[PDB]
Amino acid sequence: NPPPPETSNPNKPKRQTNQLQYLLRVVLKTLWKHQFAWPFQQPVDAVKLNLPDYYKIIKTPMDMGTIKKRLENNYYWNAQECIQDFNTMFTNCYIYNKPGDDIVLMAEALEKLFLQKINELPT
Numbered sequence: 001n002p003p004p005p006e007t008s009n010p011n012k013p014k015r016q017t018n019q020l021q022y023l024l025r026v027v028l029k030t031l032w033k034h035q036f037a038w039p040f041q042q043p044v045d046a047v048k049l050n051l052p053d054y055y056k057i058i059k060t061p062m063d064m065g066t067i068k069k070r071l072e073n074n075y076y077w078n079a080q081e082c083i084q085d086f087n088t089m090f091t092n093c094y095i096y097n098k099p100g101d102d103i104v105l106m107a108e109a110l111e112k113l114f115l116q117k118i119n120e121l122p123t
């Protein structure tokens with residue numbers, strides 16, 4: 001498995017815009033709570049899950065635990081950087097798994113909530 005994604009941005013200002021505050025305290029908070037969040041809260045272990053070619057098809061692994069850490073410890077420069085990671089997480093799932101998979105049905109319910117909160121992004 002690839003090393004876990006970087007979650008610290010050491011030489012960077014400790015300033016969170018209100019949109020990034022929204023991404024943590026509304027978007028992430030609500031998604032993290034969701035019933036189907038648990039398959040997405042940690043990096044995919046392609047070995048233990050026996051996912052052939054997962055890291056061949058998936059060039060940018062991403063997960064909600066990484067996003068949570070990055071939001072919590074000031075990694076993102078701006079909101080769109082964070083929104084892109086959420087999208088990457090959902091994209092990875094949709095391009096690797098099949099439309100009938102439980103994991104895809106769960107991702108779609110999770111993404112519905114994501115999109116709803118993003119539709120209400122302030123400013």
Ligand SMILES: COc1cc(-c2cn(C)c(=O)c3cnccc23)c(OC)cc1CN(C)C
Nearest residue numbers: 038039040044049051092093096097102103
């Ligand atoms: C963390 O453990 C799990 C991960 C996943 C999981 C997540 N993502 C994002 C995937 O793409 C994915 C792709 N294929 C197979 C599995 C997963 C999971 O699928 C419902 C179940 C568990 C529970 N386990 C005790 C088997």
